[PDB]
């Protein structure tokens, strides 16, 4: 289950994730790779702003799907 | 003495900052960290299509009051 996370500058990272993983889990994995705290991350899929508590299956995020990472200011 | 500038991400999300023309780009990054908690190393700042260098000042780039700098996330590797 290899999904992609795309920044606003073209750069894209790959993540190995399991169907049950929550969006928060996804943000933790991104912190592990990029050092960006989850609270500073906004994730978008299919024009939707993703919620931390939900899983990738609740958004029908399939293998090779591409999520969008956006900076989240206070 | 002081002036307001905007720092904007690519989504249009904006932050306002009070700065001096004599402030360094690193000073601006540190002010952004103070406001947003984003470490300087994660920040790349852009103005007039020129990547901004930590050691230079705002006046070096002729950044004026109400000018807008763009903020971009810096990734690892």
Short mmCIF file of C-alpha atoms in Angstrom, two decimals:
data_model
loop_
_atom_site.label_atom_id
_atom_site.label_comp_id
_atom_site.label_asym_id
_atom_site.label_seq_id
_atom_site.Cartn_x
_atom_site.Cartn_y
_atom_site.Cartn_z
CA UNK A 1 0.00 0.00 0.00
CA UNK A 2 2.26 2.75 -1.34
CA UNK A 3 0.62 6.18 -1.29
CA UNK A 4 2.19 9.47 -2.32
CA UNK A 5 2.26 12.83 -0.55
CA UNK A 6 2.75 15.85 -2.77
CA UNK A 7 3.94 19.28 -1.67
CA UNK A 8 3.06 22.59 -3.34
CA UNK A 9 6.48 22.73 -5.01
CA UNK A 10 6.35 19.47 -6.96
CA UNK A 11 8.34 17.39 -4.49
CA UNK A 12 6.63 14.13 -3.59
CA UNK A 13 7.36 11.57 -0.88
CA UNK A 14 6.24 7.94 -0.76
CA UNK A 15 4.71 6.27 2.29
CA UNK A 16 4.05 2.64 3.14
CA UNK A 17 0.72 2.67 4.97
CA UNK A 18 -1.91 0.12 6.03
CA UNK A 19 -5.64 0.45 5.27
CA UNK A 20 -6.48 0.88 8.96
CA UNK A 21 -4.03 3.76 9.46
CA UNK A 22 -5.64 7.03 10.53
CA UNK A 23 -4.82 10.38 8.94
CA UNK A 24 -3.01 11.19 12.19
CA UNK A 25 -0.89 8.10 11.66
CA UNK A 26 -0.11 9.41 8.19
CA UNK A 27 0.95 12.76 9.67
CA UNK A 28 3.24 10.95 12.11
CA UNK A 29 4.90 9.11 9.24
CA UNK A 30 5.40 12.44 7.50
CA UNK A 31 7.02 13.84 10.65
CA UNK A 32 9.31 10.80 10.68
CA UNK A 33 10.48 11.68 7.18
CA UNK A 34 10.37 15.47 7.15
CA UNK A 35 10.41 16.65 10.77
CA UNK A 36 7.13 18.52 10.30
CA UNK A 37 4.94 18.25 13.43
CA UNK A 38 1.45 16.89 12.66
CA UNK A 39 -0.22 20.05 14.00
CA UNK A 40 1.61 22.01 11.29
CA UNK A 41 0.28 19.74 8.57
CA UNK A 42 -2.86 19.96 6.49
CA UNK A 43 -3.58 16.96 4.27
CA UNK A 44 -5.93 17.15 1.30
CA UNK A 45 -7.40 14.36 -0.81
CA UNK A 46 -9.91 14.82 -3.63
CA UNK A 47 -10.35 18.47 -2.67
CA UNK A 48 -11.28 17.37 0.84
CA UNK A 49 -9.48 18.51 3.99
CA UNK A 50 -8.67 15.27 5.82
CA UNK A 51 -9.54 14.72 9.48
CA UNK A 52 -7.01 13.23 11.91
CA UNK A 53 -9.34 10.68 13.49
CA UNK A 54 -10.47 9.01 10.26
CA UNK A 55 -8.67 6.23 8.38
CA UNK A 56 -7.48 6.01 4.78
CA UNK A 57 -10.34 3.63 3.96
CA UNK A 58 -12.94 6.10 5.23
CA UNK A 59 -11.67 8.33 2.42
CA UNK A 60 -11.31 5.48 -0.06
CA UNK A 61 -7.59 6.19 -0.41
CA UNK A 62 -6.20 3.41 -2.59
CA UNK A 63 -2.70 2.21 -3.41
CA UNK A 64 -0.72 4.76 -5.43
CA UNK A 65 -3.18 7.46 -4.38
CA UNK A 66 -1.71 10.93 -4.01
CA UNK A 67 -2.45 13.07 -0.97
CA UNK A 68 -1.54 16.74 -0.87
CA UNK A 69 0.49 18.20 2.00
CA UNK A 70 -0.12 21.87 2.80
CA UNK A 71 1.56 24.02 5.45
CA UNK A 72 -0.79 24.78 8.36
CA UNK A 73 -0.25 28.12 10.11
CA UNK A 74 -1.66 29.13 13.50
CA UNK B 1 11.91 52.24 11.64
CA UNK B 2 9.35 49.43 11.33
CA UNK B 3 7.13 48.06 8.63
CA UNK B 4 4.63 45.36 7.94
CA UNK B 5 5.28 42.56 5.54
CA UNK B 6 3.29 39.55 4.51
CA UNK B 7 4.55 36.01 4.40
CA UNK B 8 2.35 33.75 2.31
CA UNK B 9 2.31 30.03 1.62
CA UNK B 10 1.24 28.80 -1.81
CA UNK B 11 -2.34 28.24 -0.64
CA UNK B 12 -2.63 31.96 0.12
CA UNK B 13 -2.49 31.41 3.86
CA UNK B 14 -0.82 34.51 5.19
CA UNK B 15 1.03 35.75 8.15
CA UNK B 16 1.83 39.33 8.98
CA UNK B 17 5.13 40.49 10.42
CA UNK B 18 6.54 43.73 11.77
CA UNK B 19 10.13 44.04 10.62
CA UNK B 20 12.96 46.49 10.04
CA UNK B 21 14.70 46.95 6.67
CA UNK B 22 17.89 46.06 8.54
CA UNK B 23 16.53 42.70 9.72
CA UNK B 24 18.27 39.68 8.23
CA UNK B 25 16.40 36.94 6.37
CA UNK B 26 17.38 34.70 9.29
CA UNK B 27 15.74 37.23 11.63
CA UNK B 28 12.58 36.91 9.59
CA UNK B 29 12.70 33.12 9.74
CA UNK B 30 13.17 33.30 13.52
CA UNK B 31 10.14 35.61 13.75
CA UNK B 32 8.15 33.10 11.73
CA UNK B 33 9.22 30.38 14.13
CA UNK B 34 8.17 32.63 17.01
CA UNK B 35 4.72 32.98 15.45
CA UNK B 36 4.18 29.57 13.83
CA UNK B 37 6.65 27.15 15.42
CA UNK B 38 8.22 26.35 12.06
CA UNK B 39 12.01 25.99 12.49
CA UNK B 40 14.17 28.14 10.20
CA UNK B 41 15.63 25.08 8.47
CA UNK B 42 12.28 24.01 7.24
CA UNK B 43 11.68 27.48 5.75
CA UNK B 44 12.64 28.75 2.32
CA UNK B 45 11.72 32.37 1.75
CA UNK B 46 11.07 33.85 -1.68
CA UNK B 47 10.75 37.42 -2.98
CA UNK B 48 10.75 38.66 -6.58
CA UNK B 49 11.79 35.23 -7.84
CA UNK B 50 15.03 35.15 -5.87
CA UNK B 51 15.60 32.62 -3.09
CA UNK B 52 16.46 34.65 0.01
CA UNK B 53 19.74 34.07 1.82
CA UNK B 54 19.90 33.91 5.61
CA UNK B 55 22.76 36.38 5.96
CA UNK B 56 21.40 39.22 3.85
CA UNK B 57 18.92 41.88 4.99
CA UNK B 58 15.48 42.89 3.75
CA UNK B 59 16.88 46.15 2.36
CA UNK B 60 19.38 44.11 0.33
CA UNK B 61 16.40 42.77 -1.61
CA UNK B 62 14.59 46.11 -1.53
CA UNK B 63 11.70 44.62 0.40
CA UNK B 64 9.33 47.50 1.16
CA UNK B 65 6.37 47.99 3.49
CA UNK B 66 3.42 45.71 2.73
CA UNK B 67 5.67 43.61 0.47
CA UNK B 68 4.81 39.92 0.22
CA UNK B 69 7.36 37.15 0.68
CA UNK B 70 6.45 33.59 -0.21
CA UNK B 71 7.12 30.74 2.20
CA UNK B 72 7.90 27.23 0.97
CA UNK B 73 8.46 24.04 2.94
CA UNK B 74 12.03 22.63 2.77
CA UNK B 75 12.22 18.87 2.68
CA UNK B 76 14.95 16.43 3.70
CA UNK B 77 17.06 14.43 1.26
#
